Amino acid sequence: PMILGYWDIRGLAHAIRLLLEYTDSSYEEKKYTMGDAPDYDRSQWLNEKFKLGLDFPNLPYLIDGAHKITQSNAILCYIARKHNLCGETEEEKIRVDILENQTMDNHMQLGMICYNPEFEKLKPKYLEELPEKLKLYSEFLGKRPWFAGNKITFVDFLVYDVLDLHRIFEPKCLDAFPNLKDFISRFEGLEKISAYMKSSRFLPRPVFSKMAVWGNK
């Protein structure tokens, strides 16, 4: 079956996992354990990084038979294409492309300060700007059931992940955007999504690696 390599954490593999489950894909997981500080030993991965036959060795990676893939968004499109979740109309594809990258940006913005030793200092400013960021997603979604349009796409997994990570960071952050909350309900309401969230496989934390100042555990 398919095999998804990644750290023994949520991180970037989250949306993928969620996607794999929703698509009822058959897959295994090669979770890599990172050593404790101050070393943060990553040999478990490095002693296999270049033996998997990946073109650009990295985490996460996906191995589907002869197909060795890296880069989260690439892995998602790969899985999505097999289930027509990459968009169909012209406008659908545009929205998918924009979000695919937008979420990636917002995700890093968060991860940047969370990995920053001076995290406690930067937090006040980040929170001040967050409402605006969230608002943007709200404006974008509008009265649509999903982000791409009427049909769910892989970007809905990416958007969810981001929004979830934020209700976790600042719980009240979503209160001002009812439609976004409905999105989360609607998303977590999906059959296979709900079932998986209740299974032993569900790994919502640690949000980041051990090197993080926040969500490291």
Place this chain on the structure above:
Amino acid sequence: PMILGYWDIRGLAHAIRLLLEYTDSSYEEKKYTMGDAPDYDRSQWLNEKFKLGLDFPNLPYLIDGAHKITQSNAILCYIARKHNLCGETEEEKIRVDILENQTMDNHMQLGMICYNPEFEKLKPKYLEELPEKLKLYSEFLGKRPWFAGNKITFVDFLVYDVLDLHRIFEPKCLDAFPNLKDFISRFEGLEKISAYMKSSRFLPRPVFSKMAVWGNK
């Protein structure tokens, strides 16, 4: 005609520009000037950031009639889809997806240290690792004329940009990979690309913004 907003620099708009020219697309450019230090006044853009009707106000952006787009990779796919340069076969799309993101990573890696005030100190390490990064691209391309396969795709523009930025940073960097040099020859060898490189429109520098430590001018 189409309109491409961005800073009065190379940056992320480079590959786009290159793509637009090769596609013989009709377009204008809304270059935004950033103020000198220590303020780096960005008012010229901020006083118009939210009036363009962009979903996620950002630079670069592309306006094609009713279509307002942001996110470099999104803009590229938009332009590419109009000219069938987004890939066709399954393997083609995979490669496109991987590179589309890989290049973005390598580009930031460069941009990160060049914007880092302690640039001179980090440089030795970055150069030590670069050969391997380059090697990967070499390994990937192989005997193929283009990265996606036999046909040129928008990623060849993204890969070129990255490679170019590095021969500029470290000229001898490519000497060890002849196939990558042939790629640059073959790319700058394209009729519309060559013509554009010789026109008044060509803007190879500044590589980055004024806030940069390297390639700021």
